Amino acid sequence: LTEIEHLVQSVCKSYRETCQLRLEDLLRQRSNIFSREEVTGYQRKSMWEMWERCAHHLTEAIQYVVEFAKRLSGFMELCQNDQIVLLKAGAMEVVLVRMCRAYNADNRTVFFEGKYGGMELFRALGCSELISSIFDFSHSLSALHFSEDEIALYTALVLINAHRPGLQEKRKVEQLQYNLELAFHHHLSKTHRQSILAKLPPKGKLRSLCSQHVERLQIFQHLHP
Ligand SMILES: Cc1c(C(F)(F)F)nc(-c2ccc(Cl)o2)n1-c1c(Cl)ccc(N2CC(C(=O)O)C2)c1Cl
Ligand SMILES: Cc1c(C(F)(F)F)nc(-c2ccc(Cl)o2)n1-c1c(Cl)ccc(N2CC(C(=O)O)C2)c1Cl
């Protein structure tokens, strides 16, 4: 009951130490929305510049996930090859999940470069379908009203996934996965939140979305290296 409770707190500590922005701030900033003139300003940027901006922000967000993983008890006990495979396959998925905190379902806006703005902010990039999908995903995750501890445990499980192709110690990643699943379950029971298990996105949906994402990202990169 303490080995589990300590694991839960280890994941929560690691998450807290590695998220960029406080939930309190993001909710506070909800009134601070981009003006029409400011939105137009973003829409008038070249695709090259918007891509440079976004790629930079995503590189940063991914770096925090690497840090999150380094502080996850058990992650660093895996062999380096497996660490890398998990990070390569899961970090962007974690970033996508983390972002639901910065998404406002009331007006379908996201916190971006200091203010809240809608889908249309990213028009210069010319991939409305992908962006719209990212917004839809965020919207449905935001309906769950994830707690900070729930985000920590859920994103830990996004990352520690034994089904990633390329693992050399699959059984050891399984052990960490199952311990985290039990920790998640234990924690939801104590908070009377077991209902959210019935409400989580189908695991493939997150893979699917981030595959579409990486597909477009590889197009961006071979356009502007
Ligand atoms: C693995 C890794 C490491 C670490 F910890 F291992 F040094 N640091 C980063 C990192 C920091 C900032 C960014 Cl951006 O990435 N990554 C990392 C990650 Cl988390 C995700 C994807 C990729 N990609 C997609 C490409 C591929 O699929 O080959 C390479 C990489 Cl390199
Ligand atoms: C514009 C874009 C692209 C694309 F299509 F250009 F690749 N991908 C994403 C993305 C989000 C999560 C993942 Cl995973 O990918 N965005 C995007 C979106 Cl839709 C919304 C907000 C933000 N940001 C950076 C800030 C933050 O770090 O919270 C707010 C970004 Cl970068």
Swiss-Prot record:
GO terms for biological process: adipose tissue development; cellular response to sterol; circadian regulation of gene expression; lymph node development; negative regulation of thymocyte apoptotic process; negative regulation of transcription by RNA polymerase II; Peyer's patch development; positive regulation of circadian rhythm. It is found in: Nucleus. Induction: Up-regulated in the state of obesity. Residues 3-225 form the NR LBD domain. Isoform 1 is widely expressed in many tissues, including liver and adipose, and highly expressed in skeletal muscle. Isoform 2 is primarily expressed in immature thymocytes. Changing residue 131 to N: Nearly abolishes transcriptional activity. The keyword Transferase does not apply. Keywords: Activator, Biological rhythms, Developmental protein, Disease variant, DNA-binding, Metal-binding, Nucleus, Receptor, Transcription, Transcription regulation, Zinc, Zinc-finger. GO terms for cellular component: chromatin; nuclear body; nucleoplasm; nucleus. The keyword Metal-binding applies. One of its GO terms (molecular function) is RNA polymerase II cis-regulatory region sequence-specific DNA binding. The AF-2 (activation function-2) motif is required for recruiting coregulators containing LXXLL motifs such as NCOA1 and NCOA2. Belongs to the nuclear hormone receptor family. NR1 subfamily. Nuclear receptor that binds DNA as a monomer to ROR response elements (RORE) containing a single core motif half-site 5'-AGGTCA-3' preceded by a short A-T-rich sequence. Key regulator of cellular differentiation, immunity, peripheral circadian rhythm as well as lipid, steroid, xenobiotics and glucose metabolism. Considered to have intrinsic transcriptional activity, have some natural ligands like oxysterols that act as agonists (25-hydroxycholesterol) or inverse agonists (7-oxygenated sterols), enhancing or repressing the transcriptional activity, respectively. Interacts (via AF-2 motif) with the coactivator NCOA2 (via LXXLL motif). Interacts with the corepressor NCOR1. Interacts with CRY1. Interacts (via AF-2 motif) with the coactivators NCOA1 and PPARGC1A (via LXXLL motif). Interacts (via AF-2 motif) with PROX1. Interacts with FOXP3. Interacts with NR0B2. It is linked to Immunodeficiency 42: An autosomal recessive primary immunodeficiency characterized by increased susceptibility to concomitant candidiasis and mycobacteriosis. Candidiasis is characterized by persistent and/or recurrent infections of the skin, nails and mucous membranes caused by organisms of the genus Candida. Mycobacteriosis is characterized by infections caused by moderately virulent mycobacterial species, such as Bacillus Calmette-Guerin (BCG) vaccine, environmental non-tuberculous mycobacteria, and by the more virulent Mycobacterium tuberculosis. This is Nuclear receptor ROR-gamma. It comes from Homo sapiens. The chain holds residues 267 to 491 of 518 of the full protein.
